[PDB]
Write an enzyme that holds these catalytic residues in place. Structure first.
Site, PDB file in Angstrom:
ATOM      1  N   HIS A   1      -3.044  -1.804   1.166  1.00  0.00           N
ATOM      2  CA  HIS A   1      -3.242  -0.377   1.421  1.00  0.00           C
ATOM      3  C   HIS A   1      -2.515   0.136   2.667  1.00  0.00           C
ATOM      4  O   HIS A   1      -2.432   1.353   2.858  1.00  0.00           O
ATOM      5  CB  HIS A   1      -4.748  -0.058   1.508  1.00  0.00           C
ATOM      6  CG  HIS A   1      -5.090   1.375   1.196  1.00  0.00           C
ATOM      7  ND1 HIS A   1      -4.254   2.429   1.493  1.00  0.00           N
ATOM      8  CD2 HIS A   1      -6.145   1.915   0.540  1.00  0.00           C
ATOM      9  CE1 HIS A   1      -4.804   3.556   1.076  1.00  0.00           C
ATOM     10  NE2 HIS A   1      -5.944   3.270   0.477  1.00  0.00           N
TER      11      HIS A   1
ATOM     12  N   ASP B   1       3.896   4.660 -18.853  1.00  0.00           N
ATOM     13  CA  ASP B   1       4.239   4.070 -20.125  1.00  0.00           C
ATOM     14  C   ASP B   1       5.207   2.932 -19.869  1.00  0.00           C
ATOM     15  O   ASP B   1       6.183   3.100 -19.137  1.00  0.00           O
ATOM     16  CB  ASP B   1       4.856   5.133 -21.018  1.00  0.00           C
ATOM     17  CG  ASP B   1       5.046   4.674 -22.438  1.00  0.00           C
ATOM     18  OD1 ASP B   1       4.876   3.456 -22.734  1.00  0.00           O
ATOM     19  OD2 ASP B   1       5.374   5.557 -23.260  1.00  0.00           O
TER      20      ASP B   1
END
Length: 409
Positions: free
Chosen positions: A166, A350
């Site tokens: 992070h 995708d």
């Protein structure tokens, strides 16, 4: 107040994790992490999960293999994600960009997408196995900055899990980065957005329970507060409730200072001058810090805690035009110990198999507001609270009491 127990379990078989290096030699540099992505509270990991239904025409292709090779090509451009973070002189963290490689796990699971239920909704079963915690990985410094697991299913679908370090980006960045990876998996030779790295512009005995609260009860809690505060977000309300209950339940000294801290993304909340660079994927988060004395939270009604939370939100969002360094600032001082953290998980990648069937996220209190439409057609929120059994039962007791009242009148 209902508990949600995950009632699905499956074997998972994983190969040994492999280091993925950028497909092409990249620059060996020492990059700096900004003062936002450097701060203590953000020295964690940030995790996500994507579910993909089987596609028959994609039969000749192994999703792990498409994605792993895509990853190589992706790490060419996002080559910091193949580096390690480490300690600069003084107390600042930097990225050692030497192409050491991200981590990648190929796996298979004795279960099918359908066996997860209708619909795909969190929290998910066996996620600790979907995204394995390879020993010697979980530290911030000297660990791979990206770990991803592709796990294929008996039905021919597959899950894709990933854990970012992070200090390098946030959820919004993740979205950009995930889309980039998807376009490269999908034949592209470059992401649509070319990434930049200009973090200098920003320098200068425990038990778990998950709870469902129907929008019924939320409605009740709303009608039980001052009208001038009744317009809050449902996040704001539920965080007020959690701060209140967690504090009462924590049974602390009435004089102790109580903190309620949460991330707010300011990427699109501020109008920056100079603007931000087009490929910036650094951390862009404000941390409102609502404080009160223990005794005021416990003695006063929910309106006190709620009002305080909203004044916190506003105070951290007050300025809406300026430079990043003036408008975006670290969490001031050492994050307290009495704190409590709440992340809002209520608000198109995708790789060849289409859009995902679902796409989301895998000592004080840290919890999440997870949307969840119930068994019978109630939208609602799932809260995965975890505390000591003493604290935890007291926490349920007090939140139950508030619930009973809010609707019963």
């Amino acid at each position: 107040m209902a508990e949600i127990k995950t009632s699905l379990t499956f074997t998972v078989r994983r190969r040994e994790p492999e280091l993925v290096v950028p497909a092409e030699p990249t620059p060996r540099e020492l990059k700096l992490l900004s003062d936002i992505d450097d701060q203590e509270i953000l020295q964690s990991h940030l995790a996500g999960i994507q579910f993909f239904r089987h596609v028959p025409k994609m039969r000749n292709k192994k999703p792990a293999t498409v994605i792993k090779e895509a990853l190589a090509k992706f790490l060419v451009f996002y080559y910091p994600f193949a580096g390690r973070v480490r300690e600069g002189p003084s107390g600042k963290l930097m990225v050692d960009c030497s192409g050491q490689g991200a981590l990648f796990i190929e796996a298979e699971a004795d279960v099918t997408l359908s066996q997860f239920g209708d619909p795909l909704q969190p929290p998910f079963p066996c996620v600790e196995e979907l995204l394995y915690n390879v020993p010697g990985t979980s530290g911030i410094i000297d660990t791979p900055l990206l770990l991803c697991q592709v796990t294929h299913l008996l039905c021919g679908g597959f899950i894709f899990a990933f854990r970012f370090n992070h200090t390098m980006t946030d959820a919004q960045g993740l979205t950009l980065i995930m889309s980039a990876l998807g376009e490269i998996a999908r034949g592209a030779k470059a992401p649509s957005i070319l990434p930049v790295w200009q973090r200098e512009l920003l320098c200068s005995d425990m038990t778990q329970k998950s709870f469902f609260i129907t929008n019924t009860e939320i409605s009740a809690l709303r009608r039980h507060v001052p009208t001038h505060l009744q317009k809050c977000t449902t996040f704001e309300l539920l965080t007020a409730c959690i701060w209140r209950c967690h504090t009462i339940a924590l049974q602390p000294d009435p004089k102790e200072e109580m903190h309620m801290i949460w991330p707010v993304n300011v990427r699109n909340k501020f109008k920056f001058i100079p603007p931000l660079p087009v490929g910036y994927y650094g951390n862009l988060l404000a941390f409102p810090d609502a404080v009160s004395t223990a005794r005021d939270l416990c003695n006063k009604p929910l309106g006190y805690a709620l009002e305080l939370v909203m004044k916190a939100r506003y105070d951290v969002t007050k300025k809406r035009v300026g430079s990043v360094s003036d408008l975006v600032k670290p969490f001031k001082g050492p994050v307290p110990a009495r704190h409590a953290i709440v992340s809002d998980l209520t608000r198109t990648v995708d790789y060849g198999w289409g859009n995902p069937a679902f796409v989301g996220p895998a000592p004080g209190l840290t919890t999440y507001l997870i949307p969840h439409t119930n068994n019978k057609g109630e939208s609602g929120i799932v809260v995965p609270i975890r505390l000591p059994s003493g604290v935890l039962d007291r926490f349920v007791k007090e939140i139950n009491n508030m619930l009973t009242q809010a609707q019963k009148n």
